[PDB]
Design a protein around this ligand. Structure first.
Ligand SMILES: [Mg+2]
Ligand SMILES: [Mg+2]
Ligand SMILES: [Mg+2]
Ligand SMILES: [Mg+2]
Ligand SMILES: [Mg+2]
Ligand SMILES: [Mg+2]
Ligand SMILES: [Mg+2]
Ligand SMILES: [Mg+2]
Ligand SMILES: [Mg+2]
Ligand SMILES: [Mg+2]
Ligand SMILES: [Mg+2]
Ligand SMILES: [Mg+2]
Ligand SMILES: [Mg+2]
Ligand SMILES: [Mg+2]
Ligand SMILES: [Mg+2]
Ligand SMILES: [Mg+2]
Ligand SMILES: [Mg+2]
Ligand SMILES: [Mg+2]
Ligand SMILES: [Mg+2]
Ligand SMILES: [Mg+2]
Ligand SMILES: [Mg+2]
Ligand SMILES: [Mg+2]
Ligand SMILES: [Mg+2]
Ligand SMILES: [Mg+2]
Ligand SMILES: [Mg+2]
Ligand SMILES: [Mg+2]
Ligand SMILES: [Mg+2]
Ligand SMILES: [Mg+2]
Ligand SMILES: [Mg+2]
Ligand SMILES: [Mg+2]
Ligand SMILES: [Mg+2]
Ligand SMILES: [Mg+2]
Ligand SMILES: [Mg+2]
Ligand SMILES: [Mg+2]
Ligand SMILES: [Mg+2]
Ligand SMILES: [Mg+2]
Ligand SMILES: [Mg+2]
Ligand SMILES: [Mg+2]
Ligand SMILES: [Mg+2]
Ligand SMILES: [Mg+2]
Ligand SMILES: [Mg+2]
Ligand SMILES: [Mg+2]
Ligand SMILES: [Mg+2]
Ligand SMILES: [Mg+2]
Ligand SMILES: [Mg+2]
Ligand SMILES: [Mg+2]
Ligand SMILES: [Mg+2]
Ligand SMILES: [Mg+2]
Ligand SMILES: [Mg+2]
Ligand SMILES: [Mg+2]
Ligand SMILES: [Mg+2]
Ligand SMILES: [Mg+2]
Ligand SMILES: [Mg+2]
Ligand SMILES: [Mg+2]
Ligand SMILES: [Mg+2]
Ligand SMILES: [Mg+2]
Ligand SMILES: [Mg+2]
Ligand SMILES: [Mg+2]
Ligand SMILES: [Mg+2]
Ligand SMILES: [Mg+2]
Ligand SMILES: [Mg+2]
Ligand SMILES: [Mg+2]
Ligand SMILES: [Mg+2]
Ligand SMILES: [Mg+2]
Ligand SMILES: [Mg+2]
Ligand SMILES: [Mg+2]
Ligand SMILES: [Mg+2]
Ligand SMILES: [Mg+2]
Ligand SMILES: [Mg+2]
Ligand SMILES: [Mg+2]
Ligand SMILES: [Mg+2]
Ligand SMILES: [Mg+2]
Ligand SMILES: [Mg+2]
Ligand SMILES: [Mg+2]
Ligand SMILES: [Mg+2]
Ligand SMILES: [Mg+2]
Ligand SMILES: [Mg+2]
Ligand SMILES: [Mg+2]
Ligand SMILES: [Mg+2]
Ligand SMILES: [Mg+2]
Ligand SMILES: [Mg+2]
Ligand SMILES: [Mg+2]
Ligand SMILES: [Mg+2]
Ligand SMILES: [Mg+2]
Ligand SMILES: [Mg+2]
Ligand SMILES: [Mg+2]
Ligand SMILES: [Mg+2]
Ligand SMILES: [Mg+2]
Ligand SMILES: [Mg+2]
Ligand SMILES: [Mg+2]
Ligand SMILES: [Mg+2]
Ligand SMILES: [Mg+2]
Ligand SMILES: [Mg+2]
Ligand SMILES: [Mg+2]
Ligand SMILES: [Mg+2]
Ligand SMILES: [Mg+2]
Ligand SMILES: [Mg+2]
Ligand SMILES: [Mg+2]
Ligand SMILES: [Mg+2]
Ligand SMILES: [Mg+2]
Ligand SMILES: [Mg+2]
Ligand SMILES: [Mg+2]
Ligand SMILES: [Mg+2]
Ligand SMILES: [Mg+2]
Ligand SMILES: [Mg+2]
Ligand SMILES: [Mg+2]
Ligand SMILES: [Mg+2]
Ligand SMILES: [Mg+2]
Ligand SMILES: [Mg+2]
Ligand SMILES: [Mg+2]
Ligand SMILES: [Mg+2]
Ligand SMILES: [Mg+2]
Ligand SMILES: [Mg+2]
Ligand SMILES: [Mg+2]
Ligand SMILES: [Mg+2]
Ligand SMILES: [Mg+2]
Ligand SMILES: [Mg+2]
Ligand SMILES: [Mg+2]
Ligand SMILES: [Mg+2]
Ligand SMILES: [Mg+2]
Ligand SMILES: [Mg+2]
Length: 114
RNA sequence: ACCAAAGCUAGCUCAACAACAAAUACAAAAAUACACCAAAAUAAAAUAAAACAUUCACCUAACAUUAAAGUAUAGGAGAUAGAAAUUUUUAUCCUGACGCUAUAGAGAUAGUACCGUAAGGGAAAGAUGAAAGAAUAAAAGUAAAAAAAAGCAAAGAUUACCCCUUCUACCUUUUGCAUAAUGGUUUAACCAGAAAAAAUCUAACAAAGAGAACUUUAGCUAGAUACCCCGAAACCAGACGAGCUACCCAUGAGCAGUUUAAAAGAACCAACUCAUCUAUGUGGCAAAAUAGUGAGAAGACUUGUAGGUAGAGGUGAAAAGCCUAACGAGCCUGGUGAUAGCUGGUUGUCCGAGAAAGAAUUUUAGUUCAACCUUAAAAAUACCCCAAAAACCCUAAAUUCCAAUGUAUUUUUAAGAGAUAGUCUAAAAAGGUACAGCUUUUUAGAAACGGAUACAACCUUGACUAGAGAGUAAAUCUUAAUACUACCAUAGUAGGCCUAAAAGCAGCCAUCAAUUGAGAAAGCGUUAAAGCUCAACAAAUUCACCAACAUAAUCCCAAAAACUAAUAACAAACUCCUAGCCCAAUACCGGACUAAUCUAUUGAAACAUAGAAGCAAUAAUGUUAAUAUGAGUAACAAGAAGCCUUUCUCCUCGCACACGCUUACAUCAGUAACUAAUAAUAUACUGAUAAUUAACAACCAAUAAACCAAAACAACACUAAAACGUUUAUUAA
RNA sequence: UUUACCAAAAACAUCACCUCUAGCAUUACUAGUAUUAGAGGCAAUGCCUGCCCAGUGACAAGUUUAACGGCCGCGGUACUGACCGUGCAAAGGUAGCAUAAUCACUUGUUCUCCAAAUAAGGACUUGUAUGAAUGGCCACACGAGGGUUUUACUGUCUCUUACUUCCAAUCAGUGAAAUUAACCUUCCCGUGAAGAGGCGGGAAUAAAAAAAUAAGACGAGAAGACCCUAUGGAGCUUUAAUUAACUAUUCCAAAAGUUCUUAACAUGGACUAGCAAUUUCGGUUGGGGUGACCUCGGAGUACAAAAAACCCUCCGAGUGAUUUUAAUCUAGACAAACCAGUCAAAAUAAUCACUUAUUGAUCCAAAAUUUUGAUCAACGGAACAAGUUACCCUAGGGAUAACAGCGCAAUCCUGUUCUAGAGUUCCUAUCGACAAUAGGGUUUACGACCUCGAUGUUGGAUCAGGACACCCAAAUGGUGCAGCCGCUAUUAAAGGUUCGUUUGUUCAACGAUUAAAGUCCUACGUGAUCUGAGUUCAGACCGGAGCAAUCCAGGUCGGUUUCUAUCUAUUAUAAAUUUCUCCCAGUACGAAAGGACAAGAGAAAUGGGACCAACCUCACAAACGCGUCUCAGAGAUAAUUAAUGAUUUAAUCUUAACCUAAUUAACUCAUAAUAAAUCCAGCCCUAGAACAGGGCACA
């Protein structure tokens, strides 16, 4: 009996998208925080956005997650319109990641007393 | 008590040093007549490359030894292969043995018996003593000594052998084996893990270490720790084979009768040749037969002796036939311990810890990485883990991540393997038939010697060794199902409407109104009527209603049971108790001891410290020897009587030669045991002695020349055109 | 003439007929010379041999089929199509013959042949897959070829029998073989790696010999010839991929001479062929083949961190479109077996197309100053290799098929529950759509769980064990049952359940009968009892498919069936069944036409048990059938009919009493067999394999 199943190429590995660090994790500058294919979490304070929508930590610190108000860039039109048609009482919210800096910025050392 | 058992020698390993005489290549072993001689062309493949085409060390040569160096180079630049320049080396003498004892060591008492036509293969065995010029009772198997209901053959035990009670042979192989999967009759003797790069361990000397060349940021140098056995079909080179069979070339030989003018690939039918059909036979009488029955039988006929063609070939009236009792390609010896991701085997004891499949792959019967894990080391946190936190429409069980806290685990570093062919149970889903002892993933569990009788996965429990102590755990199998009863029945009016009729009761409309009470009717009934009951009083009594489901093939499947009181009792490897040497296991990996040899010193009767190894067989359809079982079974043979070679009774491959065998033949003697498949006695066993006598048969000249004229009862012919010598001359001991 | 040893044939050869290739001398052919000699085809004779040079050949562009090989559509029209249109071809299958030793349908149609024929012969005949030297068609004569009829003959058979001889069993000699874990070696039903002498629950059971029979020990023999798998082999064939030697060819050099030639040898490099070499023939797969797929990404499966399978369900990619040319160097990271993949601060000075996928490692090649090279798509990639094997071989596997078992029950098979409907009226006498719920385990499948160091597989023969979902016989309910037949339903397994023609056949048709000529299971019972016609190896044709080798669950002809029994098992008690007659009574029953049971007498037949006076077989005094004899009481109940009679004062056979009654098969048992303990040497026997048993006083 002809057993042809017409479907092809279901097979891909998973991309291991997801959250790499968790709230209250210590982080060094450069660590990737989470990696996603669509924006699930947006970059907050001290979190840089990679061209593939990676989130990495800019400072040395503690990673925090947050629900905050979303005010799209006036250059990006779709989001501008989505913001436009809302009923007059409602604001948009999203989830952000943050780094909270640990090390102080610097120190004043006494080099020489002349 | 038989059968058996034991010796220590014959000789071997490895290494230093350095009886002529005759006869013979005629068909070897034969004194002697005319010739010829003599010759040479790369090694290939098996195998590595996980296939296979280029390529694959060693295999011929010498060159040795310490180095340069596994370096320069050469390679489907893969596998692997691999120099030189230049360097080093003191003499002989000084022989032996941590080499084997008769399944070893030579194959050897022998290249012999024997097996092959031939090249070639190739065994087995000996044991007393000074003297034979003296005559231990320990393997299996059996005997002494048949066997008495029952059941992996034992164990717990008992006064007692049984009788009771408790237990699925062992290996290998698998997901899982009592399996009705493989292996083995039993005994003995043989019969299977080898390497030192990196590492660890123990020592030397140390900024150096090594008895030369090298390596060095604690290193070097030395020791010690390591990696099997048996199997193809094949492929390549060189020999040997045509005494079988295939086909040829020589030289011979058969074919009677009967029929026909006939030797005409004609008839009939013997000898002779084939092999049709059936039955016997099947470890046979026979590695292809016998009995009957059949085909051909002067021809493409059968058959004897002697040549020839040889495997990359020959031969073939093609059957891929035949070429020496296996031919899709002979046999033998080499290559050759060919190569097997594939079976099958792999030998002492006792302890520690212990594994289930993520990737790639001519890969899915295999490897190599990760993860888990084992053995050492260094460290610091590891599991558990409350808020807090992880997405956008709907979205359960739950994950991820972390302090406290309960515990001791986890990570790194250095070495290593196996494993990577899983099963079921619960849960979430797919596919299929909302089927599988079905298949495919994800999360858990399990693989008791206790329960579910029996039992791999379910349930109770985790583990040692003794006790003729205790407490408990899971669990023994129960549960049910019934009835319907009075008495009575007139009215408009067969209401309209339809319709053959239509009268409650074919369908539409209406649902009215007498009686105290009876529907313009819920059933059947009739063509329509007619007729039966239900609803309505009257008389009474009232208690219910939610009903159930045939069978399989050897022979039903503990026996039984309503009851003396139960939060019983009885029940494990669990847990107490009394003592300890103090807690399971396949692959793989760590440790501690020791059996038997030999060598160093001890030891003296069995030895104890070391060093060494041919270092330990219950399993390979293992090898050899010997024993059983089947089994005293299958099967084998001699015509009668006498006075002992004389008569009888029956059936018919007989005497010579050729080839081939070699004393098997003849006489006398002996036969306990060897040969005869048994006896008697002897042509076939043993000893001694003899024997076949040449006129038959073998051996036995050349060169010239004449000669066209078949055998066939041979007159003469036929087509297919036929084997064979006389005579003359020249010389011939 | 052939497969010495499974096939003597239709296979091969062969007279004859045709194609090719050759013009010549010392070893073949050949001491030959084209009427000859070599390669072949096809098979006498007779009548024939159609059309086709486009492919591949082969020859010396052209030529060739008695070379390899081919020889059609589509529709329109007088049920058909002589005609018609248009298309493609190198030509369009003709003369014959025909259901065939010719794919299937298919047991074609019909006649003859028989009581009956899937056989045989004759016809028709599109054979859509005949067909003319890979020969087509008739015909003598011949086949140990295949098929069919008749005569005749008979032990083939109805349906067996007697007697001899070899074996045979007892005595005496001699004395093997495969095989064997150990066995102190039962039966049943369960269980279990799915078929138990060993497990569980029950049964049964002094001990050993000899003789028999073959159900079991997945019996004994051969490390399965089937199947699949090894990066195992080999033989065969070509368009597989790489290509020598050789034999021939053609050419250029060389060599000799000429001013362009080659006599025979003969070397270097080519070419073109023949013969010929070396090596392979990927993988997944609910066995393999055929089919399909092999890398890369989005969804689902996989619901909320990651991961996550299938020959799972669905969509995509092997690049475009631009402009703005999207740079160096280095912290920290994700991911990850490895290889590859990803983000990215500081320091110096690409976008849109769901956007995610648009891609290939080393080595080796070309390039310039630096870099580009693949349906390597089997996508972690061998620098370059296909077909076959039924002539096959080895290593393995029950890791995986075919047989059988087991699981499951889609399909199949028996019931019930529900009434629409049929049945004129009437659901359920006889049935019954759409549907519900239980069962059975034989079918075709599906799984791959035991077996590949063998569990030998279809149909018969013989002998049967069992189920009951009764085909007969036996009791009964209902009827759209007057009676006779019937049609349905309930209870009953002791006994039965035929002989033929055609097929290998179970099935099926058909002839003739029977009381009936059941449906099943038992390894589709039964091959250490038998038979192999069939499937299923080697030979061979004929369609077809391939260029071939070979091949098609397509036909046809032919073709080895081995075991001496160790163990378990087993090796004779009886106590009938069925017809058909004759009667009754031509009566009961119906308007008549047709027409019964029950009771009672007879005959047979079959099955048990025996026996020879006759007959028949008989050369023994016996054995034997074709001949003769003899065959049973009582008790029980199943389904169903009735009486008294309560719960419930009527009723009511009652899963209420008490007695009851009527009625099958089994199954019991009356009755029958056997049944005196020990002398046994001999010798007789109607008794016997041995041992046992009966006789041996007359007479
Ligand atoms: Mg996906
Ligand atoms: Mg995946
Ligand atoms: Mg190789
Ligand atoms: Mg190998
Ligand atoms: Mg190979
Ligand atoms: Mg070599
Ligand atoms: Mg020796
Ligand atoms: Mg000899
Ligand atoms: Mg003994
Ligand atoms: Mg016992
Ligand atoms: Mg078991
Ligand atoms: Mg074994
Ligand atoms: Mg298995
Ligand atoms: Mg079994
Ligand atoms: Mg077996
Ligand atoms: Mg096996
Ligand atoms: Mg055996
Ligand atoms: Mg070392
Ligand atoms: Mg050190
Ligand atoms: Mg080779
Ligand atoms: Mg090879
Ligand atoms: Mg010869
Ligand atoms: Mg000869
Ligand atoms: Mg004659
Ligand atoms: Mg003749
Ligand atoms: Mg005869
Ligand atoms: Mg004859
Ligand atoms: Mg004849
Ligand atoms: Mg011949
Ligand atoms: Mg042939
Ligand atoms: Mg053949
Ligand atoms: Mg031979
Ligand atoms: Mg080997
Ligand atoms: Mg590959
Ligand atoms: Mg493999
Ligand atoms: Mg923590
Ligand atoms: Mg498997
Ligand atoms: Mg594997
Ligand atoms: Mg079950
Ligand atoms: Mg698990
Ligand atoms: Mg138990
Ligand atoms: Mg304990
Ligand atoms: Mg009225
Ligand atoms: Mg009223
Ligand atoms: Mg206890
Ligand atoms: Mg342990
Ligand atoms: Mg040893
Ligand atoms: Mg031993
Ligand atoms: Mg054997
Ligand atoms: Mg052994
Ligand atoms: Mg014996
Ligand atoms: Mg016997
Ligand atoms: Mg005998
Ligand atoms: Mg005799
Ligand atoms: Mg002689
Ligand atoms: Mg003798
Ligand atoms: Mg012959
Ligand atoms: Mg033969
Ligand atoms: Mg024959
Ligand atoms: Mg012929
Ligand atoms: Mg000619
Ligand atoms: Mg002809
Ligand atoms: Mg023609
Ligand atoms: Mg025609
Ligand atoms: Mg046909
Ligand atoms: Mg044709
Ligand atoms: Mg032709
Ligand atoms: Mg033809
Ligand atoms: Mg003739
Ligand atoms: Mg003939
Ligand atoms: Mg004939
Ligand atoms: Mg005897
Ligand atoms: Mg017994
Ligand atoms: Mg079972
Ligand atoms: Mg059983
Ligand atoms: Mg006997
Ligand atoms: Mg038997
Ligand atoms: Mg057994
Ligand atoms: Mg059997
Ligand atoms: Mg095998
Ligand atoms: Mg193969
Ligand atoms: Mg191969
Ligand atoms: Mg080669
Ligand atoms: Mg393939
Ligand atoms: Mg495959
Ligand atoms: Mg398949
Ligand atoms: Mg399957
Ligand atoms: Mg395919
Ligand atoms: Mg920057
Ligand atoms: Mg390239
Ligand atoms: Mg591949
Ligand atoms: Mg791949
Ligand atoms: Mg990949
Ligand atoms: Mg054939
Ligand atoms: Mg084999
Ligand atoms: Mg299996
Ligand atoms: Mg079977
Ligand atoms: Mg099956
Ligand atoms: Mg079975
Ligand atoms: Mg069922
Ligand atoms: Mg099924
Ligand atoms: Mg499976
Ligand atoms: Mg098998
Ligand atoms: Mg066996
Ligand atoms: Mg029967
Ligand atoms: Mg019944
Ligand atoms: Mg019966
Ligand atoms: Mg059968
Ligand atoms: Mg059979
Ligand atoms: Mg049998
Ligand atoms: Mg053909
Ligand atoms: Mg025949
Ligand atoms: Mg046949
Ligand atoms: Mg037989
Ligand atoms: Mg016996
Ligand atoms: Mg027998
Ligand atoms: Mg009788
Ligand atoms: Mg009453
Ligand atoms: Mg009454
Ligand atoms: Mg009795
Ligand atoms: Mg007596």
């Amino acid at each position: 009996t002809g057993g042809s199943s017409k479907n092809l190429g279901g097979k891909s590995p998973g991309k291991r998208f997801g959250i790499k660090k968790m709230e209250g994790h210590y982080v060094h500058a450069g660590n990737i925080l989470a990696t996603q294919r669509h924006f699930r979490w947006h970059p907050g304070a001290h979190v840089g956005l990679g061209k593939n929508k990676c989130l990495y930590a800019l400072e040395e610190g503690v990673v925090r997650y947050t629900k905050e108000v979303y005010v799209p860039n006036p250059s990006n039109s779709e989001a501008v319109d989505l913001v436009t048609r809302l009923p007059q009482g409602a604001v948009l919210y999203k989830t952000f990641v943050h780094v909270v800096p640990a090390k102080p910025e610097g120190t004043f050392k006494l080099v020489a007393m002349l």
